[PDB]
C-alpha cells in the first residue's frame, strides 16, 4: 500500500539553481569540477522497493546512484569524488541527507512543495536551492 515517501518517487528534471557554485566552493570542490558540475542539468530518479530507497542522478557530468534504508549509515562516493559517510532520515516529510568526511559535514534536504521537489544543500552558512519538476 501507500507510504508517505511516495510523493518523491518518479523522474525529476532540474529547472533552477541558486548559489550552487558558492555551495560547491564551501564543500571544497575545485575550479574545473565546479565549472562542469555547475553546467549540469541533472535528472533525479527516485524509487522505493520495500525499505530500500534508490536515488539516481544523471547528467552529462556524472551518473551516480545510491540505495539506502532510512536511518542506516552507508558509504557514498559523491559526484565530486568525496568519500563520505551518509545517513538519510525523514523528518516530518523532509528527506534529510547528512554527509560526513574529513571532520566536515554537509546536509542536503529534499521536500515536495507544490509540483516541485526542492533540494536545499547547506555547508556551514552557505545554502544552495535546486528546484526539480517532473520530467
Ligand atoms: O541534486 C542536486 O541537484 C544537488 C545535490 S548534487 C550532490 N552533491 C554534489 C556536491 C558538490 C558537487 C556536485 C554534487 C549529491 C550528493 O552528494 N549526493 C547525492 C545523492 C543523490 C543526488 C544528488 C546528490
Swiss-Prot record:
GO terms for biological process: brown fat cell differentiation; cellular response to lithium ion; cellular response to tumor necrosis factor; cholesterol homeostasis; fatty acid transport; long-chain fatty acid transport; negative regulation of DNA-templated transcription; positive regulation of cold-induced thermogenesis. GO terms for cellular component: cytoplasm; cytosol; extracellular exosome; lipid droplet; nucleus. GO terms for molecular function: fatty acid binding; hormone receptor binding; long-chain fatty acid binding; long-chain fatty acid transmembrane transporter activity. It is found in: Cytoplasm; Nucleus. The modification N-acetylcysteine is found at residue 5. The keyword Nucleus applies. Keywords: Acetylation, Cytoplasm, Lipid-binding, Nucleus, Phosphoprotein, Transport. Forms a beta-barrel structure that accommodates hydrophobic ligands in its interior. This is Fatty acid-binding protein, adipocyte. It comes from Homo sapiens.
